Amino acid sequence: EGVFVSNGTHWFVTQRNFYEPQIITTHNTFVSGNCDVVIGIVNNTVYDPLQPELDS
Amino acid sequence: LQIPFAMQMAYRFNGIGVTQNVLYENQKLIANQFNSAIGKIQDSLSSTAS
Ligand SMILES: *[C@@H]1O[C@H](CO)[C@@H](O)[C@H](O)[C@H]1NC(C)=O
Ligand SMILES: *[C@@H]1O[C@H](CO)[C@@H](O)[C@H](O)[C@H]1NC(C)=O
Ligand SMILES: *[C@@H]1O[C@H](CO)[C@@H](O)[C@H](O)[C@H]1NC(C)=O
Numbered sequence: 001e002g003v004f005v006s007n008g009t010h011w012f013v014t015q016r017n018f019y020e021p022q023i024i025t026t027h028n029t030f031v032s033g034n035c036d037v038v039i040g041i042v043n044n045t046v047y048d049p050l051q052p053e054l055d056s
Numbered sequence: 057l058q059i060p061f062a063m064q065m066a067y068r069f070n071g072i073g074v075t076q077n078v079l080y081e082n083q084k085l086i087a088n089q090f091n092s093a094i095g096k097i098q099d100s101l102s103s104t105a106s
Contacts, residue, residue, distance in 0.1 A: 030077075037080075038080045038081070039080070
């Protein structure tokens with residue numbers, strides 16, 4: 001839920017009706033298939049909070 | 057508040073309980089079905105007054 005947003009250096013996800021920028025994560029997002037199908041898709045990291053929990 | 061039309065349509069899909077990726081994956085089919093469906097209005101109203 002919400003929308004992806006940037007101001008020219010970072011990508012964040014916000015709810016639609018009030019600016020509330022969050023880090024883009026596997027909790028904030030769902031997958032569907034490969035890059036090649038979507039028009040206007042962009043390259044950015046998606047964070048996974050499990051990986052530091054496995055590292056710690 | 058401006059928004060790209062393909063993203064407005066993904067929200068209008070997400071409003072009827074169809075997941076956003078169904079639009080972005082089928083965007084060419086949806087655009088062609090829409091453009092064709094408006095052509096039938098133009099031809100219907102051109103063809104008869106009734
Ligand atoms: C926007 O630009 C500033 C400076 O680079 C940066 O601190 C901020 O995190 C960026 N935010 C977004 C949404 O791009
Ligand atoms: C958006 O518009 C620019 C021209 O201003 C064009 O080069 C680009 O390919 C377009 N991208 C999409 C996702 O339509
Ligand atoms: C996105 O990343 C892939 C792999 O690094 C690269 O081939 C592709 O050209 C990139 N596309 C854009 C729009 O940066």
